[PDB]
Amino acid sequence: WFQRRESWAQSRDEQNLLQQKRIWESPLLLAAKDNDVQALNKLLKYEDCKVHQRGAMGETALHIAALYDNLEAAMVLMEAAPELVFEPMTSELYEGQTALHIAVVNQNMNLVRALLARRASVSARATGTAFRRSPCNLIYFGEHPLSFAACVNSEEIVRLLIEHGADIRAQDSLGNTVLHILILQPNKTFACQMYNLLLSYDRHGDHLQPLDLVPNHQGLTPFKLAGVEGNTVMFQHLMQKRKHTQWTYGPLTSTLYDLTEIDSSGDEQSLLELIITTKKREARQILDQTPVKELVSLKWKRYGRPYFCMLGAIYLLYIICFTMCCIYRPLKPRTNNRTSPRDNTLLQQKLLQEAYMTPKDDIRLVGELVTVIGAIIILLVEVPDIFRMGVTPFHVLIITYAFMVLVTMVMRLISASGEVVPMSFALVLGWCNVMYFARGFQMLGPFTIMIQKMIFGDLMRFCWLMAVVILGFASAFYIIFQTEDPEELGHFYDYPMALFSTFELFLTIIDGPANYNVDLPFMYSITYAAFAIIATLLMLNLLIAMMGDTHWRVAHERDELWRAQIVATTVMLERKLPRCLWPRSGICGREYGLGDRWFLRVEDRQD
Amino acid sequence: WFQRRESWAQSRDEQNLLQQKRIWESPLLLAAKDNDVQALNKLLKYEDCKVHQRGAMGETALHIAALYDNLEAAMVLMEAAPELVFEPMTSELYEGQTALHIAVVNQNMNLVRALLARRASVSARATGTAFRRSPCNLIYFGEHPLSFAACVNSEEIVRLLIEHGADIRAQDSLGNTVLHILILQPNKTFACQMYNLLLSYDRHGDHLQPLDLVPNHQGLTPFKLAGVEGNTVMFQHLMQKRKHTQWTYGPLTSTLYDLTEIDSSGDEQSLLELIITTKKREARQILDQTPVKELVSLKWKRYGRPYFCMLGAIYLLYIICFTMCCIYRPLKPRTNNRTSPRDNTLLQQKLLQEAYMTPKDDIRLVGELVTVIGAIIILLVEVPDIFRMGVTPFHVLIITYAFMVLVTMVMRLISASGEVVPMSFALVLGWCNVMYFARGFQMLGPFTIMIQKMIFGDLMRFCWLMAVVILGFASAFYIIFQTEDPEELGHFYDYPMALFSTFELFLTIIDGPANYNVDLPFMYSITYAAFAIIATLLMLNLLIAMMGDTHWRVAHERDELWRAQIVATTVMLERKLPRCLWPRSGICGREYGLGDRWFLRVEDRQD
């Protein structure tokens, strides 16, 4: 049905086996799979021999000879069938893959001289589903023959395809040209030799975003695609045509970076925004490169940190006047005589409803109307981001804060009863948002990362085995003290409280049930000595030793993930703040003869 | 008696020394141990010189000359005694070891030309107890001369034995042929050169399980024996005759694995069952090999995980209706006036006996008859495995659960008194079996391994030194507060409770005895300050630091032991479930011209 996404991997495994069956049960496809050239001359000099018959993938006999790189057998199929060269595969898995595609992928042939001598099409599009990029195809070579030749590092075949008229600007279904595909190849060193070779054959008089400024179907150039895909090797090589040394002075050079596709120019997505909003771990190592790590720590020292410690001082002072309008909330004494289950009730205030007739209730009225306005402004700069940027932690904890302030407003107006419940969330979803502003400080910055990596990490996998233990012993502790007097040692008197006592006894944050005047059940002393060992001794200290084994093997990741929080903050502070504040980064080159671009120089010793 | 298993190692140490005594006190055995050929001609040209006399191991003089590789002295014993070649050793330690065996083991001789020129037997069986495989013999070479020659890596001697008629199919007492013995040799690289050489001399027209399909006396072929013995090097080499590349496409090949001795064909034990049910740590590295790690994670993603989260949702829902039939158990109030030792008794319910006359006792009756049926079905699919597979943790914890449910059933029928005791075990042996189903999840999967490795690990060796301390201080705390008023600070009022208070004070899961109104004994403040240091401070934190030193040096073992739990689960889910469910793994080759075997292809980049 829908649960089988492995029913297409199953459908192509039994399609490759059916390919090898059709080769064996047909005489010339087996004669092309082997050489068998003395037997291959005989099979084609017949009356109605089918040279145009297909296999399971739609192979002709020239496809089989080019796939098993039989040079001598493939010459015979082109002599006695010159029309066979122009014929592609027709199966849905391999659509349009001509015989020129197959002889190119094998990184060699003397057949690509012979196929192009028979005027084979260099603009054939291998549009089949085995050539799309996916996490189920081991290759993404493109669609075109020079896209296949440039990804196998064949500099003799790429030059020989272009001399026969291969279009240098051919794009895929994804929009990727030849120069995009080289970036997302697994062999990053050999793609740098090929990136230079494919640009040498541009020389295109109609320049018009010449060859490495043309984007794919999601608006990424080759330079920005190396940023998203995490290609560090093709990022330093792509940066070489953007820097230029002003002067060298002994050991001291002074380059000048172009910075026109890294910094936020206009409404276009800059390369600092693509690295943050991508889902790769290796993409955030471009934040350590020499035009980027000196661009981020130049608009964070100057402009990013003063505009982040002003928003961290307004918010920390906004929430002291939210705390004090919950400490001083209106609260009368009780009227209903406590005719409740007596001695199991001690609530004695039951807050006011329309009583504000006090000059201390008017000072609070100003101070609790600031926190209403301050929680509407959160829902006017955060909700127009969630429902304007698709659907995809401190975002969630500040809509939730701003929702709980509006819930306790509606409960204040309609005089609803339980108002301690939205305030208790808003006093702790609110104060724990001051941990957001512990990323402008390098000391207490990564300490907020390794709280996220442990809540949704080491403590989320400990959660599901702790709850196994504290449901087994809490249900064992309950039925032991069920035939009991709860007046003394009443830790487990009803089944919710036995769960919460046993959770507390797991963490040793209450004492441990003992009376010493009255004989406890005999079964209690055994099942609590078992709960003491396998839960307090064993399993609690197993969790503080898998948080101390977490650190030293995430100590590099957690410390390089601080300046990825600086980029995400500097990008956010730049988009929200207007252009009257926040001057642009770098030195504009209108008054220096360098164009309309914004440059960033840096000097360094090179020894 | 029986306690001396080192009385046979003692019996062969004094048997090798007695061998060296008999050589010295006899003239020609010392003349054969050295060369002494001018003295060796003289000793044999006598009237009644004993050339057929024995040593302590039953050596003839040709054995001594072949053991100390004296080529020139051994020629003289064969000229003047050609009958001496055919004579084996007769001691129980070295039975049947002819002189051809000894000249072969030394990895060289020109004597093996000379012994075979005297038509020495190539089918001599060295059946002595120093040649059986054991953890007290450093060698297991086999029984036959070409079994001795192939295990010393002598390709000149193996070819020269076969040309004189050495049987290629000779088997041991263990059933091992020549090709089995090469697998369980300590030098794994040189056995791959020999495995190919011994198959080249097969060419056997009577094929009939040709040479590497013949099993030993426990049903293992050479391919399955490399799985059990942990031979990773002879597993990849043995797999080369099972894969075959369908096609190579540039960097992209497509092999097709045979999978007929790895997957469960029928009632025969497949190789995935042999790796799990063996006692070697190095055998479970064959689970990471390219036809096996892609077979396991193909019938776990498809069929193993849906049939394991259905059994983990039935069991977790079976035991919520066992918990609720213990929360709501029938329980009257007390009748016997508490004429017990008054104020030391608070049990006040003493559960019902035949009172079910309630419409809430009938809903429980359905819910506690499900847990009776659900605990019989456990004892019908687990007891027919224990008493049907020899005699050899979550097996034990679910027979014990299913036994405690049947004990609390018998106590319910006969109206037995103490029923809180089988329920208290069954509520915690039952809930802690939900940790079994935390192996279908890779996050909380290895977290169940390092609970087993710490209960029967770091906490089992801490158990025997903690109980030394909490018997010494509990017996010191008892006699201090023995001359005391137990009405106030009654932690230690009788000797069982002093043990349980001191166990709790060890773990700091009760407070710590203090009264502050009445003067405690002076001796208490000294012996509790000693118990605070050497038990709470020193020895408790010694145990949480040897669980945190456990992790980072078992972090690789504990994480590769997760997918050994997946294999053991996938094997168990395949044996229990019928063939109507659970389709077989791989693609059958009846409709593709490949035979009756079940193949598994995989494609990969090879750069």
Ligand SMILES: CC(C)CCC[C@@H](C)[C@H]1CC[C@H]2[C@@H]3CC=C4C[C@@H](OC(=O)CCC(=O)O)CC[C@]4(C)[C@H]3CC[C@]12C
């Ligand atoms: C009536 C007066 C006092 C107005 C008071 C309002 C301010 C105290 C509020 C309104 C909008 C708030 C801002 C709304 C948006 C954000 C971004 C938010 O960051 C995120 O979205 C989280 C990023 C992540 O960690 O993933 C952190 C708080 C902050 C700066 C808020 C800081 C506090 C602000 C300025």
Ligand SMILES: CC(C)CCC[C@@H](C)[C@H]1CC[C@H]2[C@@H]3CC=C4C[C@@H](OC(=O)CCC(=O)O)CC[C@]4(C)[C@H]3CC[C@]12C
């Ligand atoms: C690692 C964590 C996420 C997993 C384990 C969580 C549980 C151990 C905790 C979380 C919330 C706790 C519950 C929160 C609410 C209640 C209700 C509470 O009831 C009352 O306080 C009644 C008083 C009244 O209503 O007046 C009793 C404890 C109990 C069941 C708690 C029992 C223990 C719980 C389930």
Ligand SMILES: CC(C)CCC[C@@H](C)[C@H]1CC[C@H]2[C@@H]3CC=C4C[C@@H](OC(=O)CCC(=O)O)CC[C@]4(C)[C@H]3CC[C@]12C
């Ligand atoms: C690491 C562990 C495995 C080694 C140490 C275990 C002991 C410290 C524990 C395990 C079981 C405990 C015992 C379990 C049962 C009892 C009976 C108990 O007696 C009662 O509760 C009497 C009440 C009644 O019978 O009504 C007193 C504590 C005692 C001796 C406990 C003392 C401490 C013991 C020996």
Ligand SMILES: CC(C)CCC[C@@H](C)[C@H]1CC[C@H]2[C@@H]3CC=C4C[C@@H](OC(=O)CCC(=O)O)CC[C@]4(C)[C@H]3CC[C@]12C
């Ligand atoms: C009346 C109705 C509700 C029937 C309910 C019965 C089921 C809830 C029980 C009966 C048989 C049980 C199974 C019996 C065998 C096993 C294998 C057992 O695994 C082992 O043997 C442990 C392996 C190891 O860790 O060494 C784990 C539980 C499981 C799946 C059990 C899961 C729960 C089952 C299906």
Ligand SMILES: Cc1cccc([C@H]2CC[C@@H](N3CCN(c4cccnc4)CC3)CC2)c1
């Ligand atoms: C993940 C794992 C693997 C293997 C073994 C475990 C332990 C989990 C339960 C544990 N019992 C739990 C409770 N018992 C108990 C209960 C009441 C009275 N007296 C004794 C003692 C031991 C025994 C084994 C866990």
Ligand SMILES: Cc1cccc([C@H]2CC[C@@H](N3CCN(c4cccnc4)CC3)CC2)c1
């Ligand atoms: C494994 C090991 C090696 C070497 C030494 C030890 C310590 C174990 C007992 C320890 N005493 C135990 C109790 N004493 C004591 C007791 C009562 C009142 N006042 C004092 C103090 C010290 C002293 C040495 C352990």
Ligand SMILES: [Ca+2]
């Ligand atoms: Ca305490």
